[PDB]
Amino acid sequence: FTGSHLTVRNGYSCVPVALAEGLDIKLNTAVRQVRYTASGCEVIAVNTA
DNA sequence: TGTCCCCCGCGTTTTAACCGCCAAGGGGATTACTCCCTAGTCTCCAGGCACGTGTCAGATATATACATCCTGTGCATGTATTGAACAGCGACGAT
Numbered sequence: 001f002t003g004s005h006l007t008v009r010n011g012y013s014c015v016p017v018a019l020a021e022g023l024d025i026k027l028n029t030a031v032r033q034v035r036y037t038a039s040g041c042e043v044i045a046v047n048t049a
Numbered sequence: 050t051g052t053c054c055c056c057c058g059c060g061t062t063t064t065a066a067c068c069g070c071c072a073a074g075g076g077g078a079t080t081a082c083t084c085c086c087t088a089g090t091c092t093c094c095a096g097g098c099a100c101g102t103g104t105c106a107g108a109t110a111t112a113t114a115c116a117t118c119c120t121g122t123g124c125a126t127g128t129a130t131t132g133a134a135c136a137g138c139g140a141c142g143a144t
Contacts, residue, residue, distance in 0.1 A: 002133095004134075
């Protein structure tokens with residue numbers, strides 16, 4: 001890309017926190033298995049706590 | 050047009066050309082004499098030329114490979130141009 005190199009003066013985490021506005025995110029949820037078949041998918045996940 | 054040098058002109062130095070006169074024999078010119086050689090003449094015939102003929106060395110036509118002659122691509126390199134990334138200075142608000 002052209003131009004100079006720039007930084008985020010106030011921490012770059014302001015982007016993903018703003019992008020998460022209005023979404024249905026399941027925090028503290030680790031995925032174990034991922035099942036995929038011809039008629040659908042099934043995701044097995046557990047709680048990190 | 051521009052340079053460098055190669056002759057031209059001129060004074061002074063060096064050489065032998067030129068003339069005048071004598072001394073000598075080498076060789077060319079001239080004559081007299083003899084015979085060997087060539088022009089002229091005749092007869093004899095084959096060497097040389099015209100004429101005819103047969104054919105292969107060479108000119109002609111047509112197809113291909115070789116040479117070359119010149120212009121147009123490429124390359125490479127240097128240079129010019131432009132964009133970008135270092136560098137102000139000052140006014141403002143936040144601390």
